[PDB]
């Protein structure tokens, strides 16, 4: 009569890596590293707005395909790539940092400003500028001469910020194709604008000149921006070439924003976005993207890193019982992890041991948990996709990225082989308990056959072995028919 | 008769977490996360100016709140919020890559620049930088025209760096409120400043116009300024709206420069400042702020985590601690692992010193390996006073918080293992001795199986103490033990 | 009658650093981290460029040290200290762009942008750039005017890049010494020079000024750059003190670009450069130089971190290896594990091939996953000889520190942690090996208590032969051992 000892086994089993080996063959496994997309913006629960064809600069300045986003409001901002912040030829001064600091903004609230003109024309319009017939950006004012070639007056205008928040303030300095087109619109002279408040202090002067036609027109209207703190007052002095602002913009309170080429989803929910879609994972590593944003897993350079969900598959090691004095283990096995096979005159019994497999399942199951967590921190875009940023603050963050990618992968594959060391030896530290636990319990009435196996020199039918396998064996009761061996 | 042997527990123990469970209770635990904060800069050996109101910038021209900061020298620059670069309304350009330069300098050093003036003059002075009555900067001249109007002559003026460092060369362009105040000031025409050195080399055209009235005035003087290297000769040639530079300054040696709005004390010392005071720590990790600069704990998000220094606290890998040893011994006060004998003369409970010292070395090597001191000095890039650009501000955030995820992972992990591995160390330290002692009594005892020793035999005090120093012999006693 | 169960051992071992104990003796240990370096640039088929004393910039320009440089093709690009992008005295505005901009470009191929003016002077030279006499860059023209004071029209060229890859455009702003040499140069009245396109806008202006003398020249000829998108149209609205350019330039492929001193090795392959020479190594980490440049080992301020590649060294976890076992043999010079018996015949000492491939397996697989090659290439961002701007490269070297201070944490855990698994490795297998010979041994034999088994029988050599390879019957000595 005998009791064997043995752990569970699979047909195909999974390979993983190890501290010490590489291609382990374990019983079960699963995937650290996120490689499944959504090519679709998850949006739901989310107010999003669409920029389409506006810029997102536009919605501060107010060309036509931004009408609509004037006053936006909303918790997820996408930039789409035929999005122009202009309609007349031009471009913004630090467009990135603002860029950055509306897609946080939350949208935009528009207020008058209170700019009243006399001795002057307040009504420039272009043709690019096409709402009706010919028009201008909502949110400015193209100043000219009162007519044709007259003197601009020499004028100031100031404007106190009466909030609790600061303002966004943008205004335009003309570029003509010409001196007699600059002279034509403002008059003869030297043209200077004059920015002032008390966090800033900046002057700018037109360059008339010829460049190449954008839109039809060879003109340049550029935009300049400040943040106006409470209480503070923004001055403008001026003289011609100037694109006055109208109303001043706040920011609402909390969004991000995205740049995207996908549809939007109102029916799925995801909070890690990038320019192919959505990444849904509680996977702690993705190997999708690394310039994605909001709350995402960690970009690794790695495709796949399986951590080891079970012990080492042995079919037909710090502790020396798996893989070890255990020749194999029992594809039969279905019940649990560790298990009783007897043999006495009823003969062939395989059992499962709850305890043990268990306690293992739950060890590996708090690993899992431990592993499989969120990163409540969020990150937004500090690159661009589709207008490039500085050549040199560029490579500053494309250094730094790296740097960080190497970092998080490398962290990565070492937790990876580390939690996997640690999973097969906790496995075989539970196996050797176990075998432990009945050596101790037969105490004199059995021998070791060094297989695994029990000895029992005493006869031990099916209510005995069950005596064995639920600990209430006592082994008084055999201690002198088992020990006259 | 018998003899078991175990482990020491507690009531009321402390939780970690592990790599496998959260909430695990050990007999004794210390934090590598600091919070605790002194209110105060700790400046004890340490050359300490407060500059108080007066600006970092300041100190190279010399508003009249920077008199006497003007050749000013410590190991450790202080400035504070209520602190201001100008007397006159004005700002300076690239101004936080100058207060980064004037943190690190270990004070400046002035030298007159020996500028002569025929023709113009020289005494502008402003109700503003009020001294004696108006006056100016006292690094600065402000040239004006001879009389109330007419013209100020064209002139160039040319300084040549004598010594073997860098110097720091600051001008300043006039704004006047209006044209017809610079052509009052300087004459009608255009004003033209050019400085050249060689890797360096500018032109000036001041802007003329209505600014908001700071300090009353509407006129803004912004400065510049450039580096000359040896044997390097700076040109200045202007002809009006021109704040002409009087001394140059030259960096002493090496300082630190915090922004804080506490207190000084000169009573404790520390290497590691922020805003709100000093952090003075041994531990690897701090939750105050991650903006704190010189040698300090890396900032991690979480503010506690807890480092197991003790076994696994079990109340009344290897399967002994929390194993077939059902339960530990809060009467084991004199270590960690034990012996309990019960034979005749009464009962005994002793300690072991080998393995309960064992584990002590080992579990206080972790602990002299973790509270290390990290001798890298981190700077100042930000500024909590005046905010950065935006964009390169918006770039520092974004590092800074991928290096405090970087480091709260490690923390978080490096805890964690750590405490996995010392539960697992005293759990063999308490199987190793087990064993011992099994190997010890060979055939005269046998296991029960709750980590006892049942002796078949007469073992009395003399022979449980042979056991526990390990000088029993098991010879003396196999003929009577066997026969049971 | 007994036999032994013991491990290898050496005099003299290797100490090593764990997770919780300095100085543990090792029989074996290996460095990790790099110190040795070869003081060549080992570019063994990398087709190399050493521009020498030709500056990375004049490139485009083509001052008379980079006449052979004008459409150079390399993968590695060396910059030296004497190096000089210029002849007659300027400089560049964006200069470090630029410079990164060419040092991944793998050379650059120029092309004639068409140009053609009337009414004004094209030959425009200087005593500085001296080919035969007073010349000028190769690929820059010097418009003037015909008299010695004539007046430069108004005029526009532009320019369409009519290839699929972006374009690079250099032109130039001159600097004269005054007024009257502008005046003399290109007429009167204020100067203006536009250049527009898709991506770019701007306005530039002369400067004319005194100021010191370079090469003996006081004007300063200054560059600026653009890059035309394909399709994209530059155009030029220039009246005077304008340096037109003549070909544009396009960049080639890819390269790597490093700044060296020292000489170039066409017989040594390398993918890791720095200042000082090459570094050729597989170790995962090095404390050469932490601005080193392609395919490096990552940066650690330690010098040496010592990986254990055997066991604990005892001369004369588990409990087995300086344990219950007093002491290594040296004598076992066979392998890792090994046997001792002692019986009539004499006394024996043979090794176990099983438990020593076993370690040796899992060490080695210890190591082929440390040493591993990083297939990430970082670019230069820093420059030794130029140097950058003052906040940008606070920037950079506070992030290049931060990220030396991490890896200088993982390799220091990384380090630690690996010696304590493979002490407790190497404990493991010894263990594993004694209790095998234990269950071998079944009831005719008894344990001694330092590692050694009682036979309580006759065991001959060929008895400890059949023992040692798992031949061992114990029913043919069971009744014979069981008598005692
Ligand atoms: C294998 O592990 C995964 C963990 O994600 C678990 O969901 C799955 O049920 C496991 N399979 C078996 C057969 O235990
Ligand atoms: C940074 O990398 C992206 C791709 O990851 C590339 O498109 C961009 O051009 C790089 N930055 C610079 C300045 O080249
Ligand atoms: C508990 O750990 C702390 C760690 O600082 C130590 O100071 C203290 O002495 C320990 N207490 C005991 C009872 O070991
Ligand atoms: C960076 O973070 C600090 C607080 O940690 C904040 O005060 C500052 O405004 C941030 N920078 C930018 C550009 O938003
Ligand atoms: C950055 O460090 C290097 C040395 O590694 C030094 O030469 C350089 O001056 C430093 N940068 C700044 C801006 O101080």
């Not at 001026?238 to 706040?250: L, Q």
Request: aromatic share 8%; hydrophobic share 30%; charged share 25%.
């Amino acid at each position: 009569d005998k009791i064997c000892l043995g752990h569970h086994a699979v047909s195909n089993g999974t390979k993983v890596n190890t501290l010490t080996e590489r291609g382990v063959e374990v019983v079960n496994a699963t995937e650290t590293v996120e490689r499944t997309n959504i090519p679709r913006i998850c949006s739901k629960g989310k107010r999003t707005v669409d920029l389409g064809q506006c810029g997102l600069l536009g919605t501060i300045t107010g060309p036509p395909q931004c009408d609509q986003f004037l006053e936006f409001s909303a918790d997820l901002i996408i930039e789409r790539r035929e999005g122009s912040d202009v309609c007349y030829p031009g471009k913004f001064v630090n467009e990135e940092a603002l860029r950055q600091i509306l897609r946080e903004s939350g949208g935009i609230d528009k207020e008058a400003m209170g700019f009243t003109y006399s001795g002057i024309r307040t009504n420039g319009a272009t043709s690019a500028c096409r709402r009706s017939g010919s028009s201008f950006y909502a949110e400015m004012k193209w100043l000219l001469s009162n007519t044709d070639n007259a003197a601009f007056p020499q004028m100031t205008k100031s404007y106190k910020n009466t909030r609790k928040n600061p303002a966004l303030i943008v205004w335009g300095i003309h570029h003509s194709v010409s001196t007699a087109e600059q002279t034509k619109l403002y008059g003869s002279g030297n043209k200077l604008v004059t920015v002032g408040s008390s966090n800033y202090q900046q002057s700018f002067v037109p360059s008339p000149g010829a460049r190449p036609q954008v839109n039809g027109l060879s003109g340049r209207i550029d935009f300049h921006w400040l943040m106006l703190n409470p209480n503070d007052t923004v001055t403008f002095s001026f003289n011609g070439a100037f694109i006055a602002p109208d109303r001043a913009s706040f920011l609402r309170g909390k969004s991000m924003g995205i740049q995207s080429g996908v549809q939007v989803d109102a029916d799925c929910e995801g909070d890690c976005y990038y320019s192919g879609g959505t990444i849904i994972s509680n996977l702690p590593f993705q190997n999708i993207d690394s310039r994605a944003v909001g709350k995402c897993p960690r970009y690794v350079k790695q495709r796949s890193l399986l951590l080891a969900t079970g012990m080492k598959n042995v079919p037909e090691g710090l502790f020396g019982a798996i893989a070890g004095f255990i020749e194999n283990g029992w594809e039969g096995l279905i019940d649990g992890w560790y298990g009783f096979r007897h043999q006495n005159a009823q003969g062939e019994g395989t059992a499962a041991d709850y305890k043990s497999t268990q306690s293992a399942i739950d060890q590996i199951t708090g690993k899992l948990n431990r592993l499989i967590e969120k990163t409540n921190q969020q990150f937004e875009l500090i690159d661009n996709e589709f207008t490039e940023v500085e050549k040199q603050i560029g490579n500053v963050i494309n250094w730094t990225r790296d740097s960080i990618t190497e970092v998080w992968s490398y962290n990565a594959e070492l937790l990876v082989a580390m939690e996997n060391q640690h999973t097969i030896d906790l496995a075989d530290s539970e196996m050797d308990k176990l075998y432990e636990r009945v050596k101790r319990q037969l105490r004199e009435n059995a021998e070791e056959d060094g297989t695994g196996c029990f000895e029992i020199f005493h006869k031990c039918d099916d209510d005995c072995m069950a005596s064995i396998r639920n600990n209430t064996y006592d082994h008084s009761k055999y201690r002198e028919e088992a020990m006259q061996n």
